[PDB]
Design a protein around this ligand. Structure first.
Ligand SMILES: [Cu+2]
Length: 99
C-alpha cells in the first residue's frame, strides 16, 4: 500500500491515515508535499514485543525531497500508531492495523 506524506493541497497529513494490511504486506510512504517529513512508530503504541527500531525512521532522520520513500513491512498482528515528528502537533498522525 502506498501512503502519501502530505496531501496534494499541501495539508500535513498521511493519505490514507488509517488503514489495515495483512502481515508481510509492504507499506510505501512517499514524500509528497509539505516536506520534510518522517515516519516514527510510537513505542508505547505498537504490539507487545515489537522493536520500534526495526520499523521506524529515527526522529532525527528526514525525507527532504519530493519522491523520496520509506518502505516497511509489518509482521506482528495488532495496532500500530505512527506520526511525523516535526508535524505531530499539526495532526500528522496515523494508525495501521495488521490483521
Ligand atoms: Cu510531516
Amino acid at each position: 500500500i502506498d501512503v502519501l506524506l502530505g496531501a496534494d493541497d499541501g495539508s500535513l497529513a498521511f493519505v490514507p491515515s488509517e488503514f489495515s494490511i495483512s502481515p508481510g504486506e509492504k507499506i510505501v510512504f512517499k514524500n509528497n508535499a509539505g516536506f520534510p517529513h518522517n515516519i516514527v512508530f510510537d513505542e508505547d503504541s505498537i504490539p507487545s514485543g515489537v522493536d520500534a527500531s526495526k520499523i521506524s525512521m529515527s526522529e532525527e532522520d528526514l525525507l527532504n525531497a519530493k519522491g523520496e520513500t520509506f518502505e516497511v513491512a509489518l509482521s506482528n498482528k495488532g495496532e500500530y500508531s505512527f506520526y511525523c515528528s516535526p508535524h505531530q502537533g499539526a495532526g500528522m498522525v496515523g494508525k495501521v492495523t495488521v490483521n
